[PDB]
Design a protein around this ligand. Structure first.
Ligand SMILES: CC(=O)N1CC[C@@H](C(=O)Nc2cncc3ccccc23)c2cc(Cl)ccc21
Ligand SMILES: CC(=O)N1CC[C@@H](C(=O)Nc2cncc3ccccc23)c2cc(Cl)ccc21
Lengths: 304, 304
C-alpha cells in the first residue's frame, strides 16, 4: 500500500550522461554507442540565442570545438551533424555503459522520468508528464539543458525527451531524441505561448482507481453517467474528452476494483462540480493527472 | 524554475541490490563490500511472524540456507550474524559496484530517497520523509522488504533506512542499517499503533520559501509574528513547535528571498487559520512538509 509519484530507477541513464562544451556554453549530452546527443544551442552564445541561424553557426564549428567529457575523461570527437534541434557528435569510443535503448516519441498525457543533470552530472530524478499542450512541468535550472526524460521496460530504456528551454511562464519545453520539439516551440529566445493546458482525464480516473485500491473510497458515490454527459462536464472543467479507448485502457483497473469506468466517471463528475470539501485523496487536496493507467497498474502490482 | 519531489539518482544504490532467500521467504538485501544486509524476518515463515523468536529461528539456519543472488549469479555465504533486526551475511566476494558509503540514523523531519525493490530488482525511486512519529508514507508491496532509503553527498551514499513492514494503517516502518527500528515498532505481526503524526513546520516554511523563489507569492502578507505566538497556532494545527535552530536553518532561504523567518511564519499562520481558498502553492492544494530547507536550497541552486 501507499501511492507515490515514482520515477524509474535512473542507473542505466546516469551511465550515459556527459558534459558537452562548445565555446563558453556547457550543457549535458547523452552518450549511447559512439554518439553523443545534445541540444544544438550548445553552439550559441547568449547574444546568438535572440535570433539564431544554427546552420551558419555550425559552419564556424569544427570537431575540436566540441568538448565531450564523460566523468573526468575526455572523449575524442570525430564527426558532428545537426538533426533538427540536436547535435550528434560521433565519438571514437562506444559507451561501455550503453544500455538497451530505443528512441520513442511519447504522446501527450504520457508520463516519464527525468534525470536532471548539470555539467554532465546527475543531481536528481523525478516523474512528470507530457502535458496536453506539449510542455512539461519540470524542475530545471540554468545548465540542465541536455537532461533526458525516459521510460524503462525491464532492461530497455526508451528515451523520449531532451530538455532545451524554459518558457517565461516557468514551464519546460524540449525535443524527442531525433531533435523534434514537442509542441510549437522553437529553440530561440523569443516569446512563446504554450497553448491552453487541459487535465488528462484518463490519468485522473486511473489515480481515482489507485485511491480505491489503497483504501481511499470517500469519493465513491451511488451514481453513474454516460460518456457524452461526462464529457460535457469535462469540457467545462478544462478536462480532455474521454474516449472509448481511454475506457478500454481503464479496463484492468475497472476489473481490479469492480467499479465500472462510467461509475468512476460519475464520481469524478461530482468531485468536479462539488470540489473536495477539505478532504484529500491519496494525500492530495486536488485531482492528480500525472499517473497513467499503466503507471497505476505497475505501482499497485510491482513491475520491476 | 519548477519544484518537484525529487529523489537522488539511484544508480549507486541499484548496484548493491540483491535477492535474499531463506526457506520459502524471499526479500531484498543490500550488498556492500563482502556483507549483505537484509531484514532478519527473511528467516520466518508466515506462521512464525505472529510471535517470532528470532534467536531460536536463526539457530535452525546455516550459511547454506541463505541464498544470495546478485543479478543472475549466486554469491557464496560464509557467515551469518543477527544485529538487532537485520541479518548480516558475509559473502566471499566484495561487491565491485560498492559505492563510497556511510550508515547514518536520520532524525524525524529529514527526507531521503527510497529505491523500491522486488526480488533484488529495482522497480522505482521516490522521495519521502521520516515522519515525526517515525513512520514513512512510502509505496511498498509484498516483497519490497529490504528496500533502502538513502541520501547522496557528491560520491558518498548515506544509507539511513531499510524497509521491514507495513502497519495496518497503510504507513511503513523500518530500521536504520544497524537494524534499529525507527519508532516503537517491532518486527512482529501484531497491532502496532504509530503515534500522532505532526506536520514538519520547518519543512512547510522551507517549501513556502521555495514557492517565493519560483514565483508563487499570493500567500505573502503584511504581517509578522513572534516564535511564541506562531507556536500557539502551530499546536492547534498539529504542527511541530518551531525552535530557534529551525529559524537558523531557514537563514539561507530567508537571506535569498529577503523575507524574515518570522514574517514567513505569519504567512503560514494565516494559511493555517484561513486555508487556501481554492488556490494552490507550487501546484499543491495543501501545505507540503516533505522538503527540508537543505532540499529546497539543493533544488533551487542545482547541487549535483
Ligand atoms: C529562455 C532563454 O533565455 N534561453 C537561454 C537559455 C536556454 C534555457 O532556456 N535554459 C533553461 C532551461 N531550463 C531551465 C532554465 C532555468 C533558468 C535559466 C535557463 C534555463 C534557452 C534555450 C532555448 Cl532553446 C531558447 C532560449 C533559451
Ligand atoms: C504485517 C504482516 O503481516 N507482516 C508480514 C509481511 C511483512 C510486511 O509487512 N511486509 C510488507 C511491507 N511493505 C508493504 C507490504 C504490502 C503488502 C504486504 C506486505 C508488505 C511483515 C514484516 C514484519 Cl517486520 C512484521 C509483520 C509483517
Amino acid at each position: 500500500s501507499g501511492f507515490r509519484k515514482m520515477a524509474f530507477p535512473s542507473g542505466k541513464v546516469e551511465g550515459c550522461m556527459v558534459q558537452v562544451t562548445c565555446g563558453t556554453t556547457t550543457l549535458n549530452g547523452l552518450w549511447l554507442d559512439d554518439v553523443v546527443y545534445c541540444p544544438r544551442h550548445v553552439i550559441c552564445t547568449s547574444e546568438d540565442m535572440l535570433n539564431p541561424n544554427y546552420e551558419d553557426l555550425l559552419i564556424r564549428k569544427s570537431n575540436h570545438n566540441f568538448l565531450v567529457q564523460a566523468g573526468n575523461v575526455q572523449l575524442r570527437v570525430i564527426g558532428h551533424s545537426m538533426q533538427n534541434c540536436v547535435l550528434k557528435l560521433k565519438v571514437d569510443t562506444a559507451n561501455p555503459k550503453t544500455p538497451k535503448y530505443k528512441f520513442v516519441r511519447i504522446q501527450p498525457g504520457q508520463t516519464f522520468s527525468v534525470l536532471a543533470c548539470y555539467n554532465g552530472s546527475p543531481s536528481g530524478v523525478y516523474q512528470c508528464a507530457m502535458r496536453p499542450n506539449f510542455t512539461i512541468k519540470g524542475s530545471f535550472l540554468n545548465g540542465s539543458c541536455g537532461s533526458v526524460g525516459f521510460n524503462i521496460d525491464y532492461d530497455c530504456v526508451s528515451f523520449c525527451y531532451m530538455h532545451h528551454m524554459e518558457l517565461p511562464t516557468g514551464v519546460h519545453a524540449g525535443t524527442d531524441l531525433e531533435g523534434n520539439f514537442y509542441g510549437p516551440f522553437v529553440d530561440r529566445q523569443t516569446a512563446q505561448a504554450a497553448g491552453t493546458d487541459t487535465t488528462i482525464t484518463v490519468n485522473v480516473l486511473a489515480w481515482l482507481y489507485a485511491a480505491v485500491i489503497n483504501g481511499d473510497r470517500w469519493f465513491l458515490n451511488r451514481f453513474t453517467t454516460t460518456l457524452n454527459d461526462f464529457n460535457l462536464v469535462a469540457m467545462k472543467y478544462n478536462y480532455e474528452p474521454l474516449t472509448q479507448d481511454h475506457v478500454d485502457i481503464l479496463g484492468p483497473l475497472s476489473a481490479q476494483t469492480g467499479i465500472a469506468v462510467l461509475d468512476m466517471c460519475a464520481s469524478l463528475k461530482e468531485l468536479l462540480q462539488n470540489g473536495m470539501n477539505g478532504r484529500t485523496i491519496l494525500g492530495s487536496a486536488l485531482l492528480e493527472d500525472e499517473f497513467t493507467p499503466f503507471d497505476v497498474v505497475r505501482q499497485c502490482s510491482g513491475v520491476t
